[PDB]
Design an enzyme around this catalytic site. Structure first.
Site, mmCIF file in Angstrom:
data_model
loop_
_atom_site.group_PDB
_atom_site.id
_atom_site.type_symbol
_atom_site.label_atom_id
_atom_site.label_comp_id
_atom_site.label_asym_id
_atom_site.label_seq_id
_atom_site.Cartn_x
_atom_site.Cartn_y
_atom_site.Cartn_z
ATOM 1 N N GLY A 169 30.379 96.413 41.870
ATOM 2 C CA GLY A 169 29.493 95.816 42.837
ATOM 3 C C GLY A 169 28.446 96.899 42.976
ATOM 4 N N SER A 170 27.856 97.002 44.024
ATOM 5 C CA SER A 170 26.890 98.273 44.248
ATOM 6 C C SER A 170 27.087 99.525 43.906
ATOM 7 C CB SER A 170 26.253 98.060 45.665
ATOM 8 O OG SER A 170 25.778 96.796 45.864
ATOM 9 N N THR A 171 28.695 99.714 43.814
ATOM 10 C CA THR A 171 28.779 101.099 43.187
ATOM 11 C C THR A 171 28.612 101.426 41.893
ATOM 12 O OG1 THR A 171 31.261 100.156 42.600
ATOM 13 C CG2 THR A 171 30.836 101.302 44.932
ATOM 14 N N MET A 172 28.141 100.262 41.194
ATOM 15 C CA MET A 172 27.477 100.521 39.726
ATOM 16 C C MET A 172 26.065 100.766 39.685
ATOM 17 S SD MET A 172 29.400 100.558 36.926
ATOM 18 C CE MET A 172 30.684 100.886 38.073
ATOM 19 N N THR A 360 28.046 101.869 49.105
ATOM 20 C CA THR A 360 28.788 100.881 49.478
ATOM 21 C C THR A 360 28.494 99.793 48.290
ATOM 22 O OG1 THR A 360 27.530 99.423 50.872
ATOM 23 C CG2 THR A 360 28.236 101.343 52.051
#
Length: 436
Positions: A169-172, A360
């Site tokens: 998700g947004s961790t990428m 996050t």
């Protein structure tokens, strides 16, 4: 003639605290000497250390993996007392990179988060960004290996961090932005139009939490824009993301090579599609592990130098892998600090006295009736680094199926705050943020 049982080696933490020990046991006429395995810090270390047989053989975790080194060689003695045919050779003592105090703290908070969120599981990892050493890696629920009855292999036995893969998700997003910076097409201040807060990628439509309008590359990270991220992918060469993600460590298992470790999923640009490449940009058409995530953030916080992940205490300092230019890594590092500040999306990751940088994420399950994404089945993710001025620890927190205060990844952010703060103090990391 009678056998002489070899004492199985001691598995200890970085400071010599015993984690797996063997004690002499007698079978009653004559006596027979055998050894009994005991685990002094059970639940926090069980998934990494593993378990032995009734025969004394490692059947799970490090007990299994390092069984030949730990078992040693049995001796032979003639049957009165006492003459040896073959001398006894004790098993090799093993010192892990793990700090049992950090391990205890991580497990205690993972239980608190799992109980508060009525979650299915809560997993974390802490890595020394400068050395690549894993200082803490645990999962709730765990189990007591000293107890012989009951048991549940299905979840507890069972190093979730190493075996579970999920959509980052947004961790990428920080890796997408790092690929765009290295292309020389962008600068942190470069602008991308995200209006009206939506975008079309074929028959798939992408949305942001709000209409963030025109954003800088730093703004894509701070506001966590899926639109900005997809647009970056679209502007770059087709090979850009799968190639930068491969150099960053994704699509391959880590240097730990834990038994049953997942390599994640990462496709090459030939496996096509601009809209699929648009989805990878915000962490969806790919699968990652907490280990690949920890190593990527450790890289971003170590001037673009990815130190090899290790469960063993070092007796050499590796040179590491130069994955990114130091100026790019530092730029991305600066953008991660801003995510925690007012105007940001990771405000609950904030720690007094320590400058924090992180992101996050939410990993949603596809749903059985294929009627969109599941609102209940999801992983709350938090990837962070501290202290921002001179980073010492990379930490990933994953909460499975939470039912708490926040919907999504925000649930994993105060868990990180708790573990990171206590972990930095225990290592006596000097403060870098003015107190108020």
């Amino acid at each position: 003639t009678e056998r002489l049982e070899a004492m199985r080696g001691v598995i200890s933490d970085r400071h010599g605290v015993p984690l797996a020990i063997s004690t002499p046991i007698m079978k009653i006429v004559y006596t027979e000497k055998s050894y009994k395995r005991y685990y002094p810090q059970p639940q926090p270390n069980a998934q990494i250390i593993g378990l032995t047989n009734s025969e004394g053989r490692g059947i799970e975790g490090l007990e299994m993996q390092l069984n030949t080194r730990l078992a040693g060689v049995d001796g032979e003695q003639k049957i009165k007392v006492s003459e040896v045919i073959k001398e006894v050779e004790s098993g090799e003592n093993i010192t892990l990179s793990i700090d049992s105090r950090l391990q205890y703290i991580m497990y205690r908070e993972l239980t608190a988060a799992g109980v508060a969120n009525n979650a299915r599981s809560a997993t974390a990892i802490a890595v020394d960004v400068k050395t690549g050493e894993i200082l803490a890696m645990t999962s709730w629920p765990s189990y007591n290996p000293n107890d012989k009855g009951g048991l549940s292999n299905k979840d507890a036995m069972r190093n979730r961090g190493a075996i579970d893969m999920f959509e980052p998700g947004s961790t990428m997003k920080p890796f997408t932005v790092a690929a765009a910076l290295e292309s020389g097409q962008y600068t942190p201040n470069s602008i991308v139009n995200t209006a009206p807060g939506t975008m079309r990628l074929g028959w798939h439509t992408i949305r942001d939490t709000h209409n963030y309008g025109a954003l800088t590359l730093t703004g894509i990270i701070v506001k966590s824009s899926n639109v900005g991220s997809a647009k970056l992918a679209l502007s770059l060469p087709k090979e850009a993301l799968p190639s930068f993600f491969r150099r960053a460590g994704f699509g391959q298992s880590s240097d730990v090579k834990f038994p049953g470790e997942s390599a994640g999923l990462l496709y090459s640009a030939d496996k096509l599609n601009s809209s699929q490449l648009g989805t990878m940009a915000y962490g969806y058409g790919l699968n990652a592990t907490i280990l690949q995530l920890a190593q990527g953030y450790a890289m971003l916080a170590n001037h673009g130098v990815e130190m090899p992940l290790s469960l063993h205490k070092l007796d050499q300092v590796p040179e590491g892998r130069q994955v990114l230019d130091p100026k790019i890594a530092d730029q991305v590092l600066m953008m991660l600090e801003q995510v925690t500040l007012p105007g940001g999306t990771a405000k609950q990751a904030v720690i007094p006295g320590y400058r924090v940088g992180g992101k996050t994420g939410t990993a949603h399950k596809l749903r059985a009736d294929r009627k969109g994404y599941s609102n209940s089945e999801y992983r709350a993710l938090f990837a962070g680094v501290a202290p921002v001025s001179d980073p010492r620890l990379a930490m990933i927190v994953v909460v499975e199926n939470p039912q708490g205060r926040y919907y999504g990844g925000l649930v994993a952010a105060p868990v990180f705050a708790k573990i990171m703060q206590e972990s930095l103090r225990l290592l006596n990391v000097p403060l870098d943020k003015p107190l108020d």
